[PDB]
Design a protein around this nucleic acid. Structure first.
Ligand SMILES: [Zn+2]
Ligand SMILES: [Zn+2]
Lengths: 77, 176, 112, 49, 134, 97, 91
RNA sequence: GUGAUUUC
RNA sequence: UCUAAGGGUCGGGUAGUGAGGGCCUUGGUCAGACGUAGACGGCCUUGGUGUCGCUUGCUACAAUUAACGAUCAACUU
RNA sequence: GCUUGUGACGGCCCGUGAAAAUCCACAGGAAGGAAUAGUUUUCAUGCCAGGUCGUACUGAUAACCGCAGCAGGUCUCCAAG
RNA sequence: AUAUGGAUUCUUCACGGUAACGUAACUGAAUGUGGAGACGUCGGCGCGAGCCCUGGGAGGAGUUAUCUUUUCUUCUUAAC
């Protein structure tokens, strides 16, 4: 299990040839004792490693979900 | 490893070979400490280790010279004919090629009495007090075996005797 | 108050059968066998632990890259750089003594 | 006041004398320790180095 | 007073420890960037391989390759020798401003490389082009 | 005596105590004479001699170890090598000792 | 000051082994557990590792010597006589 | 062969 | 039931000039996709929580009373 | 605080307290290797594969030994207020 | 077994740092050498882990003749 930060690296990795499945996980958390906010984890299943990208912005997460490849099979929660 | 001089060869017969002391180590069952001396093999490009009996004053990193024409300094080994009158040696070869037989225990040495004209002979006073004549080509290390004064301390304890004599071959406790 | 057991079949407190106690995601205590601690590699001359070299069990060095096992200098993974400095100085002065001594020997055998 | 400060000054000078005496005592003790080592053969010559 | 331009020293610390350099510019006072008595020097990273009579033309050409380097060095990290080497062929290229640019370092190293190769082919300073065995 | 001329130099002229300072002086070309303890390691002895030859500086080997050289110079610590930068009063530079 | 009037380092032996034996052990014990000067670096950093082996804490030099003291008088005289007669060989 | 050590 | 004793962490200033970091109360320009709403956000303040202040450069008793105060905790005599 | 691991030290020895497999590094440099083209699998990623035998249960006043289903013996780990 | 990316190379086999040394890499046969494997016992001192003790809060259970913002219990986090 590895955490990936760059969105460009995440997209190239999700286009990698060995990658077939990804997962979108929704968490409800608090920001600095603030309001309950949304966290989206994108977990791309590679041959060796599961790569996790953590996005704390719901709109950016939605737009990335749109940006995902079609052939990749996504499991929601 | 047994505590023996270097094997006799042309270098030690005529010139000198220089080795270096790497460690001074404790041998089980032996009072005297041992010195590991590394030499360069004259024929093959490889380092050869030797296990000498450390004399008093020998230290790690010291240069030890072995041969007929080596300096008369403590630690250096020399043929008995190359040393002057009255010198003191240790690990004295009885005869050429035996690699050391006399004065090997701690605090023991051999004094030189005088040389001989007719052939290469020298006479020596052994630690007991005997006067013996050996071939003048027999080698010896300059100085006195290290670890002297060991027998001066009482053991005081059967347990100390037990630990001393379990490493040796002497049967302890003694019967009959 | 939860008590644990060894997890391998060695039942003895040997040097290679040391355990730690760890709490798991199931909320229970459990034994976790710990491997032997690695030893820092030592300098070939002085015996001091040379720095910049990873500390691993001997077989594990076959897995890491070269950079983990060496420093960028002569004798990088073997000597400790003070020994290297002394080696360099000794070699240079040995060469210088050879030059001076050879000149002296030639002049002496000229004037002898 | 004047006699009390005289006593303070005499005490301070006596304190200095006592310190000098204790320094002398330490010097003599070091001397005796060195001689004891000499007798006991606990001194190493430098000719080896 | 003997650490001057043209002097040959032996680097005793750093990645180039054990190499022979020639001092191109000594700053005994130091500088703001290096607050210590130092020296801009040029040296050989990879010595030319020792060739013999048997070796062919291509073999000799490929065995007479030299990799130079340029560096600012603390005086305490030099073992100065008694030998001299003509630094005039690159006194202009090897300067304080050169080390502030990786490309200028590259061009200065080109200059020093060709100069040292010419000297080695001419046959000068075989000790300076000889490698120390330690 | 050698100790007496060293004492005169220590009380009158300029000196540096220690290997790093004496090497700095030799490099800068300030030293005249270097007194080296008989106990100094041989590698350091040879290096100091090479520096002094390059700097045209006289070398004298003191008879005694670091403790003896320190107490002769007049300090309470062990001293291995002393460099004489000025000997304006004492005549240690010219004497055979 | 002095916790023990006479017995000294031999206080670990209590009342055992006899007064004369304790006295004989005392001097050699004091020699053995002492800290000696180093001839090579000039520091009081030398301690025994084993009978006859003496190591300096600083400068890390190991030397061969006596069983309970760094040097023996016999070794000192042998060293001096070697020096003298090798000098006369030179002369 | 005697069995710590000291003293008488 | 009391009395006494035995500790830790943080605390230096305004008299004084002027800039720097962050949701900048209110007020000002550029300016963000989705399901009447529209945050966050890429830019600035002499203000604010003689012009308080969280920051360095510094003159001015820097403390020879920090010889004291705020805060935290254990069980021993 | 208890159990345990570990670090830097100190003490003790006329006692100074295994070996080998195995893995790594250094020195050296036989050589090989590029221009409308090479190298580097001690960087990352991707592909394939991992045989044989043990594995249940007790481990003792009911599972072993004393002719027993004997008030006996038999190595060791965890250890709450 | 092998390919792609990266790195490297027209100064062929990397640059940076005064230095200790750094990094994603950064060729290597004979031969020589070094390290790890690899090591006694005791004492106190420091640190970590599990356990022990304990405060707030969010739940569940017990007691309530009288009293107790109460007694018990859950609030966890593996290799890598
Ligand atoms: Zn070293
Ligand atoms: Zn020493």
């Amino acid at each position: 299990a590895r955490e990936i930060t760059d969105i460009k690296q995440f997209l190239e990795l999700t286009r990698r040839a060995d990658v077939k499945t990804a997962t979108v996980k929704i968490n409800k958390k608090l920001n600095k004792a603030g309001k309950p906010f949304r966290q989206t984890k994108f977990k791309v299943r590679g041959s060796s490693s599961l790569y996790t990208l953590v996005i704390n912005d719901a709109g950016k997460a939605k737009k990335l979900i749109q940006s995902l490849p079609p052939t990749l099979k996504v499991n929601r929660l | 490893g047994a505590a023996k001089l270097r094997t006799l060869d042309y270098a030690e017969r005529h010139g000198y070979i220089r080795g270096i002391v790497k460690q001074i180590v404790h041998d089980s069952g032996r009072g005297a400490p041992l010195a590991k001396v590394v030499f360069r093999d004259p024929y093959k490009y490889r380092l050869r280790e030797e296990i000498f009996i450390a004399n008093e004053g020998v230290h790690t990193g010291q240069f030890i010279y072995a041969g007929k024409k080596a300096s008369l300094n403590v630690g250096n080994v020399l043929p008995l004919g190359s040393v002057p009158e009255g010198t003191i040696v240790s690990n004295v070869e009885e005869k050429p090629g035996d690699r050391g037989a006399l004065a090997r225990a701690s605090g023991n040495y051999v004094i030189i009495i005088g040389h001989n004209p007719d052939e290469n002979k020298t006479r020596v006073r052994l630690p007991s007090g005997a006067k013996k004549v050996i071939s003048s080509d027999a080698r010896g290390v300059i100085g006195v075996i290290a670890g002297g004064g060991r027998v001066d301390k009482p053991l005081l304890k059967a347990g100390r005797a037990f630990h001393k004599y379990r490493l040796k071959r002497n049967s302890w406790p003694k019967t009959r | 108050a939860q008590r644990v057991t060894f997890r391998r079949r060695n039942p003895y407190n040997t040097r290679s059968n040391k355990i730690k106690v760890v709490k798991t995601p199931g909320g229970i205590l459990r034994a976790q066998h710990v491997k032997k601690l690695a030893t820092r590699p030592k300098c070939g001359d002085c015996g001091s632990a040379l720095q910049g070299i990873s500390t691993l069990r001997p077989r594990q060095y076959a897995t890491v890259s070269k950079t983990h096992k060496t420093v960028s200098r002569a004798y990088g993974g073997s000597r400790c750089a003070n020994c290297v400095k002394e080696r360099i100085i000794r070699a240079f002065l040995i060469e210088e003594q050879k030059i001076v001594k050879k000149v002296v020997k030639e002049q002496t055998e000229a004037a002898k | 006041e004047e006699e009390q400060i005289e006593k303070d000054l005499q005490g301070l000078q006596e304190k200095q004398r006592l310190n000098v005496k204790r320094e002398r005592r330490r010097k003599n003790e070091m001397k005796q320790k060195e001689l004891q080592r000499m007798q006991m053969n606990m001194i190493t010559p430098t000719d080896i180095g | 007073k003997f650490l001057k331009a043209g002097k040959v020293a032996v680097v005793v610390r750093g990645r180039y420890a054990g190499k022979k350099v020639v001092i191109v510019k000594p700053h005994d006072e130091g500088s703001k960037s290096h607050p210590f008595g130092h020296a801009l020097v040029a040296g050989i990273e990879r010595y030319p391989l020792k060739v013999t009579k048997k070796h062919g033309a291509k073999k000799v050409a490929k065995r007479t390759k030299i990799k130079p380097f340029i560096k600012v060095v603390n005086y305490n990290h030099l073992l100065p020798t008694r030998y001299t080497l003509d630094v005039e062929a690159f006194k202009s290229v090897v300067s304080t401003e050169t080390f502030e640019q990786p490309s200028q370092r590259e061009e200065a190293k080109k200059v020093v490389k060709k100069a040292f190769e010419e000297r080695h082919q001419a046959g000068k300073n075989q000790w300076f082009f000889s490698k120390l065995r330690f | 005596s050698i100790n007496q001329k060293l004492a005169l130099v220590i009380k009158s002229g300029k000196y540096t105590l220690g290997y790093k300072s004496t090497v700095k002086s030799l490099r800068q070309g300030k030293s005249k004479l270097i007194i080296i303890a008989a106990n100094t390691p041989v590698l350091r002895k040879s290096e100091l001699e090479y520096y002094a030859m390059l700097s045209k500086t006289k070398v004298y080997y003191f008879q005694g170890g670091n403790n003896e050289l320190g107490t002769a110079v007049g300090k309470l610590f062990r001293v291995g090598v002393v460099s004489i930068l000025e000997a304006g009063d004492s005549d240690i530079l010219t004497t055979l000792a | 000051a002095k916790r023990t009037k006479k017995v000294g380092i031999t206080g670990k032996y209590g009342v055992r082994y006899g007064s004369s034996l304790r006295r004989q052990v005392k001097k050699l014990e004091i020699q053995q557990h002492a800290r000696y000067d180093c001839s090579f670096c000039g520091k009081k950093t030398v301690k025994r590792g084993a009978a006859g082996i003496w190591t300096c804490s600083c400068c890390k030099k190991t030397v061969a010597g006596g069983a309970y003291t760094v040097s023996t008088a016999a070794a000192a005289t042998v060293r001096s006589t070697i020096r003298r007669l090798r000098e006369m060989v030179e002369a």
